[PDB]
């Protein structure tokens, strides 16, 4: 299948084992920004669901399938590949909805639906939006969407902006310099110091930050879920030209995302920006190997290239340059293994 | 057809060795001065056991233990490591000018081919509750390369268990599961999964430290002699116990820690993770009862701790506890692979 | 009679036995807030008693009748159905007020009075105000009240407000976990865990608390004793709509009450709010079996429904929901069986 | 019936409402002394239950019937008059003992049991042993007992001892002196002080105390449950002659009780003595209206006369004299309404 073609068995076993735990469902369900906003998007656009046929890609416990029911849906197909599907079935029965919700265990790339649907709902966003590569399953599910169909969420905006954080940058060499000692119990470790540094800079940093560290208006890369195909996400090239508002050293790029539910009654937004209440997605920062000096008025131009990998994530390639000086930096990051720095 | 692959799901093995390929994880283990300092003491203080001898280091990681044997005069050390950390070991061997003595042999100890039998095997195979990761079986499997006159460092391993009281910990876990009693979470009835939630939450071993005064009886000890034991002995580990209660109150579970002894020719050096000893990165492990048991001072608490090795490099743990006077009984299952790090 | 029709004899026996004890009269009288405020309301409004006919419903030891005598009342009929009525007569004689205070033994729904009165006085408030159902006896007595007569107290305000208090929550959940044991002395009790949680959470929690646990401004439900008819208190439906001020878990609703003595000279208030000095009424809190979550700005809507029962108390029904999310909590309470904490 | 002829209906309604609460069953079941001893006496005398027919009088939740089944009883009739019987039926079904335990809802004086039983078990002791007058229901059930049957408990002993507690005696007047003031908000209350004093003295005090306040070895009155008839408890005249071990003022009499399970294998004792762990029965003390001075070696003689009343309790008539001096005091207490003083 398409899923197994793009995924190492080892990665998938652990991925779906992780999501079979109720404590993880509870974690996602207890994010009120997430759960609240989805419920509002669906209920405030009841006309997009009333008496319609719905598909819920990766329903977990089925919470989004119940909001669709509250909105007046006629039939909801809830697809879930982990063992959480067993618990979703229990909740459909205990809530007297077996007539309107059908739980289909399995991967959305492999199950079969009995009819086409009017709208697909899902929550496929990972870290930096794209982590987990579940947006490809969301788009893959469009093979069941009528030409009339809508997508909830409808679009996705990735935002990237240069930041300054001297203490975050310095923390990397503080940790790596453990290896730069010539007699750790009589053993000279210094030969591995460069490797340790490299390892730390290859981790995206997951936490939040004061918006004042940002040095320029963000650049926006949009994914239109109504028009995009799975292949469009195998290689995501994000060019950027930042016009610096403050002078200082740029230590990397900060990432966040928004999604919009574009309904017939209104559009509802779900934002993980550092200016909005915190969510379980936090924000993501990718450091440059060497900081770049820029002054207010200069331009910072380059590209952020995301290359999907068979571990359900992306290899990140960032190259940036101050146009007025030619000073250049880059970095390679493995989004699968981020550093969770939040306290 | 290797012994390792026959007892290990591929998915678990891949992630296991990816996890230990990280230098940041080597740092965490090496920076535990109790671990690294005691291992060096046991080796250097028993240098006669290593002078001009052949050594095998099972799971050398970065190679620290192999360096200790080189300091003690070992004639030749074979350092086996299956993760990509093996290549980092080689770098340290070259930069420390020990290429004539330390031979890194990459691969699994169940699959490599050593050129000769060895006088002594050294390893640090202890996980949480001693037995997690199932590396003791690889340690014992390596005895096929050990001369009949040889030794094991560590030589024996003691598992200690004792009953404890801690209502806050018990209520802390039951609090998390009350989420799934909700009759109307955003209008959805979750109560049907309250049973499934409590089972999942009370399947998690609690890894952290605690005050020794929560222990309500003298610990029971279960000893594994690594010189005598056979690989197959660790597929099923049955630990009966009978505690003489020193205090009255509620028994909320059993606490677990372990000691290992390096029984050398010059002296025996002990490495302990007991709560009366300085904290290590192993901490201590506590298994909770879903329903606490009451006992008075003078009563006896008896039962069995049974560990069944699973294909995911861990153990499924069943604990049955009974106060003999009243017949009050508590049966509990725990997934040692997925613990709650509470510290 | 009206009283016997709405009261199991079994309840009435114990009820009036309880109030026949001097020790229980000492308890109420030593509440200086209660006793001092009643005296202040009566004496400050002495013109509403000067040379007037008075009726004191459920006088107990007769303390309120003496206050009316101090204010110049010409004649005070003091009705008391327990044996305490004879103790009141002793005090009337020892204080040399036989010319002004006339103890009438019996239930106010069954005694005859020589004449009509100008003002009724009484202390009929119980826990959560309505417990004991004496407000109906207080209102029933209005058959003896002249037109345009006054009522002391004149009105009663009930205040509701959501609160957060996880300790009280898992405290009542702890007691209930005893019935989850699958082997108590070898016996599986778990089949009764549902009945245990229900029973334990039907008990109102009577105690005081810090005002900072309240999550919204209180909602007020007023009872006008001058206008209300006793039948109005058989089924009390109190709608509420709170505007949440803080985000967090709502573990239930807190109840207190104030009464106002609206006299000719002055309006005197007697409050049992948590912002005010504690009284023997304390405050009341009704726990949800499952807490509700709400963010600051959300609205919590529902109704508190009180159905009076034949045991001189009420069956309480509280249904509350977070309007934005549909999170709903339905809970029942037996006001007759409180938990003094 | 016999129950209704000796009980006022108002008293009966509140009595069985009280015991319909699970919270009250837990209160008695959580007394380890009560529940642990009953279990011990039944199991350690298993020969008195194996393949026998049993009657549990006032089973409550049925805990004692389960103990009887643990001992191997063939058939157990469990009689309970309150609505707790329906809960007992649930536990019988949930413990898979519907073939051994049959719950009979109703009063033991009124229900119809088909056959004679081999042994009757019950926990009918109240404050001072006799409060609640349930011992008469226990003896009344002997109409179903074979002539060779047994009773668990077999016998009951009530112990009387003189005590000194100046603080307790004075506490009465401090409370009653609230009324001895000429202007309480302008009201002379002093006319009711005598009535307040009398009221406090008619109340037995339920709480514990330090054994050191006892001034003589206790006097013991025994009820042999195999021999007694329920009519023997309508009027219980207990003559006492105490030999004073200490000199001082005697303020009243203290009461506790023991019961013994005289089985075929052994005799097990359940004590509520002040020298033993505290139970939910505490102890009881009745004050003299005037204290009596007695020297060590003197004798304090008199009678404690308990007269049953229609409120499932007793009126207590105590009369005491110092033989050597001729000083007398007495009191007449209402056991149905005690003063709970324990803190
Ligand atoms: N939104 C996230 N970042 N994570 C939630 C993913 C949820 O969708 C489920 N899921 C992920 N991929 C798939 C798929 N291809 N088919 C079905 N369910 C899936 C997964 O088991 C979990 O319940
Ligand atoms: N001491 C621990 N609890 N864990 C450390 C395990 C270390 O041994 C390595 N290791 C584990 N099992 C094996 C094996 N069968 N063969 C070789 N190396 C192994 C692993 O890669 C890591 O470096
Ligand atoms: N305020 C309270 N919570 N209780 C006060 C009740 C007092 O009034 C008396 N009382 C209660 N109901 C009645 C009644 N219907 N008629 C007369 N006295 C009554 C009761 O005996 C006690 O003295
Ligand atoms: N041991 C005590 N002091 N009290 C226990 C009283 C228990 O016996 C029950 N009980 C009391 N009298 C009777 C009776 N005549 N018939 C049946 N059950 C009774 C009562 O319902 C409660 O469960």
UniProtKB/Swiss-Prot annotation, chains A, D:
Function, as annotated: Methylates (mono- and asymmetric dimethylation) the guanidino nitrogens of arginyl residues in several proteins involved in DNA packaging, transcription regulation, pre-mRNA splicing, and mRNA stability. Recruited to promoters upon gene activation together with histone acetyltransferases from EP300/P300 and p160 families, methylates histone H3 at 'Arg-17' (H3R17me), forming mainly asymmetric dimethylarginine (H3R17me2a), leading to activation of transcription via chromatin remodeling.
Lineage: Eukaryota, Metazoa, Chordata, Craniata, Vertebrata
Whole-protein residues included: 136 to 478 of 608
Family as reported in the entry's similarity comment: Belongs to the class I-like SAM-binding methyltransferase superfamily. Protein arginine N-methyltransferase family.
UniProt keyword annotations, A-Z: Chromatin regulator, Chromosome, Cytoplasm, Isopeptide bond, Methylation, Methyltransferase, Nucleus, Phosphoprotein, S-adenosyl-L-methionine, Transcription, Transcription regulation, Transferase, Ubl conjugation
Recorded GO MF terms: histone H3R17 methyltransferase activity; histone H3R2 methyltransferase activity; histone H3R26 methyltransferase activity; histone methyltransferase activity; protein methyltransferase activity; protein-arginine N-methyltransferase activity; protein-arginine omega-N asymmetric methyltransferase activity; transcription cis-regulatory region binding
Biological processes per GO annotation: cell population proliferation; endochondral bone morphogenesis; estrogen receptor signaling pathway; methylation; nuclear receptor-mediated steroid hormone signaling pathway; positive regulation of cell population proliferation; positive regulation of fat cell differentiation; positive regulation of transcription by RNA polymerase II
Protein name: Histone-arginine methyltransferase CARM1
Subunit structure: Homodimer. Interacts with NR1H4. Interacts with SNRPC. Interacts with the C-terminus of NCOA2/GRIP1, NCO3/ACTR and NCOA1/SRC1. Part of a complex consisting of CARM1, EP300/P300 and NCOA2/GRIP1. Interacts with FLII, TP53, myogenic factor MEF2, EP300/P300, TRIM24, CREBBP and CTNNB1. Interacts with RELA. Identified in a complex containing CARM1, TRIM24 and NCOA2/GRIP1. Interacts with NCOA3/SRC3. Interacts with SKP2. Interacts (via PH domain-like fold) with C9orf72. Interacts with PARP1; promoting PARP1 recruimtent to replication forks.
Primary location: nucleus
Organism of provenance: Mus musculus
Curated annotation (Swiss-Prot), chain B:
Catalytic activity: L-arginyl-[protein] + 2 S-adenosyl-L-methionine = N(omega),N(omega)-dimethyl-L-arginyl-[protein] + 2 S-adenosyl-L-homocysteine + 2 H(+)
Subunit structure: Homodimer. Interacts with NR1H4. Interacts with SNRPC. Interacts with the C-terminus of NCOA2/GRIP1, NCO3/ACTR and NCOA1/SRC1. Part of a complex consisting of CARM1, EP300/P300 and NCOA2/GRIP1. Interacts with FLII, TP53, myogenic factor MEF2, EP300/P300, TRIM24, CREBBP and CTNNB1. Interacts with RELA. Identified in a complex containing CARM1, TRIM24 and NCOA2/GRIP1. Interacts with NCOA3/SRC3. Interacts with SKP2. Interacts (via PH domain-like fold) with C9orf72. Interacts with PARP1; promoting PARP1 recruimtent to replication forks.
Alphabetic keyword roster: Chromatin regulator, Chromosome, Cytoplasm, Isopeptide bond, Methylation, Methyltransferase, Nucleus, Phosphoprotein, S-adenosyl-L-methionine, Transcription, Transcription regulation, Transferase, Ubl conjugation
Keyword ATP-binding in annotation: no
Cellular component, GO annotation: cytosol; nuclear replication fork; nucleus; protein-containing complex; RNA polymerase II transcription regulator complex
Effect of residue 133 to Q: Abolishes histone methyltransferase activity and reduces coactivator activity
Single biological process term from Gene Ontology: regulation of intracellular estrogen receptor signaling pathway
Protein name per the record: Histone-arginine methyltransferase CARM1
Family per similarity comment: Belongs to the class I-like SAM-binding methyltransferase superfamily. Protein arginine N-methyltransferase family.
Tissue specificity field: Ubiquitously expressed. Within the brain, present in proliferating cells from lateral ventricular zone and dentate gyrus (at protein level).
Coiled-coil region(s): none
Post-translational modification: Phosphorylation at Ser-83 is strongly increased during mitosis, and decreases rapidly to a very low, basal level after entry into the G1 phase of the cell cycle. Phosphorylation at Ser-83 interferes with S-adenosyl-L-methionine binding and strongly reduces methyltransferase activity. Phosphorylation at Ser-83 may promote cytosolic location.
Cross-link (Glycyl lysine isopeptide (Lys-Gly) (interchain with G-Cter in ubiquitin)): 94
Subcellular location: Nucleus; Cytoplasm; Chromosome
Null allele phenotype: Neonatal lethality. The lungs of neonates do not inflate and they do not breathe. The same neonate lethality is observed with mutants that produce CARM1 protein without enzyme activity. Embryos are distinctly smaller at 18.5 dpc. They show reduced lipid accumulation in brown adipose tissue and reduced amounts of brown adipose tissue. Thymocyte differentiation is blocked at an early stage. Mutants display complete loss of protein methylation of the CARM1 substrates PABPC1 and EP300/P300.
One Gene Ontology molecular-function label: histone methyltransferase activity
Effect after changing residue 39 to A: Reduces protein methyltransferase activity
EC identifiers of the protein: 2.1.1.319
Annotated stretches, region: Required for nuclear translocation: 213-246
Signal peptide (UniProt feature, chain positions): none
Sequence positions that bind S-adenosyl-L-methionine: 26, 35, 59, 81, 110, 138
Positions of modified residues (Phosphoserine): 83
Organism from which the protein derives: Mus musculus (Mouse)
Residues covered by the SAM-dependent MTase PRMT-type domain: 13-320
């Amino acid at each position: 299948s398409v899923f197994s073609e793009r995924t190492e068995e080892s990665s998938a076993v652990q991925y779906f084992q992780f999501y079979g735990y109720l404590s993880q469902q509870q974690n996602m369900m207890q994010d009120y920004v997430r759960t609240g906003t989805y419920q509002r998007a669906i209920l405030q656009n009841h006309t997009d669901f009333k008496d319609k046929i719905v598909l819920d890609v990766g329903c977990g416990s089925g919470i989004l399938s119940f909001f669709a029911a509250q909105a007046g849906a006629r039939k909801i197909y809830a697809v879930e590949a982990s063992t959480m599907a067993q618990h979703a079935e229990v909740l459909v029965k205990s809530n007297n909805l077996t007539d309107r919700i059908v739980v289909i265990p399995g991967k959305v790339e492999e199950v079969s639906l009995p009819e086409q649907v009017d709208i697909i709902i899902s929550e496929p966003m990972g870290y930096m939006l794209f982590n987990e590569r579940m947006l490809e399953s969301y788009l893959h599910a469009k093979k069941y969407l009528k030409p009339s169909g809508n997508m909830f969420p409808t679009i996705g905006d990735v935002h990237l902006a240069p930041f300054t954080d001297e203490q975050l940058y310095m923390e990397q060499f503080t940790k790596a310099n453990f290896w730069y000692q010539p007699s750790f119990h009589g053993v000279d470790l210094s030969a591995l110091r460069g490797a340790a540094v490299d390892e730390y800079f290859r981790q995206p940093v997951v936490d939040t930050f004061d918006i004042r560290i940002l040095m320029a208006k963000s650049v926006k890369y949009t994914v239109n879920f109504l028009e995009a195909k799975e292949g469009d996400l195998h290689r995501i090239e994000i060019p950027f030209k930042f016009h610096m508002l403050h002078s200082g050293l740029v230590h990397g790029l900060a990432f966040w995302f928004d999604v919009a539910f574009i309904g017939s009654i209104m559009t509802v937004w779900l934002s993980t920006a550092p200016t909005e209440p915190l969510t379980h997605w936090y924000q993501v920062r990718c450091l440059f190997q060497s900081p770049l000096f820029a002054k207010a008025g200069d331009t910072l131009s380059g590209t952020c290239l995301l290359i999907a990998n068979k571990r359900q994530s992306y290899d990140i390639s960032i190259v940036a340059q101050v146009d007025q000086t030619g000073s250049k930096s880059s970095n390679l990051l493995d989004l699968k293994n981020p550093f969770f720095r939040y306290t």
